[PDB]
């Protein structure tokens, strides 16, 4: 289902969870002609009160989004969240099919380190 590169950071000064969506690679092809039109939907479980979407990157299986989204999350609540990064195939007329997703449970993220990480997308 491809791979996603992202970076997770927390601005303690402003109580901001910072989600960098760098790129995806080796995505499956969902359009005729052997390509896709990927974008990423980004939101937090379990409350789901704010969703972001990257730009749509047309006709590519290796989109470089280079976008960053911020969520106001009080520090004491951050460990109860799960970050969802869901990669969709855009289509002009039909429903947008999900390609894959990667979820990050915050109750294991320490922010003891901030890195750019690759993950295999999952169903």
């Amino acid at each position: 289902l491809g791979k996603l590169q992202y970076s997770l950071d927390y601005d303690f000064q402003n109580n901001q969870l910072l989600v960098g969506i760098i790129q995806a690679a080796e995505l499956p092809a969902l359009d005729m002609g052997g390509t896709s039109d990927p974008y990423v939907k980004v939101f937090l479980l379990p409350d789901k009160k704010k969703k972001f979407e990257t730009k749509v990157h047309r006709k590519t299986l290796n989109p470089v989004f280079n976008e960053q989204f911020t969520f106001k999350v009080p520090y004491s609540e951050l460990g109860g969240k799960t970050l969802v990064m869901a990669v969709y195939d855009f289509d002009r007329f039909s429903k947008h099919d999900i390609i894959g997703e990667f979820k990050v449970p915050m109750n294991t993220v320490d922010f003891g380190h901030v890195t750019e990480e690759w993950r295999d997308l999952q169903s």
């Epitope: 970076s7 601005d11 402003n14 910072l18 760098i22 280079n66 960053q68 750019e116």
Partner: nanobody
Framework: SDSEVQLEESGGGLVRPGGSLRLSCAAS????????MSWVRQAPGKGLEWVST????????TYTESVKGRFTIARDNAKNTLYLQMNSLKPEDTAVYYC??????????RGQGTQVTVSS
Amino acid sequence: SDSEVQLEESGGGLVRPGGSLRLSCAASGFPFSKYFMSWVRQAPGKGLEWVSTISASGNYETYTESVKGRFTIARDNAKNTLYLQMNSLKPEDTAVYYCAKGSWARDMTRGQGTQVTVSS
């Protein structure tokens, strides 16, 4: 809320077509090294438009189609500074250039701007 953010551009000026210019931007009031940063511009007669974004790490750079290959974005997280090297400048590149906090959003926090005019 970016009430504390301060962004200060410099480096603008008059350029002949084909010439070069380097902008810089001093950033204060927020953990600069954690944020993606962007250059955006507003040309005479057009809306604000995205020019380039650099990741917080400085490792990933993206560029609007009309400046690809000609502009380079860079950052120094130790000195909280953002740079835009502009080579092979075109008259269409005339605009107020702004350094901006985050990846592209029409309402993103921006500096005061620096004027770049490309003229014969």
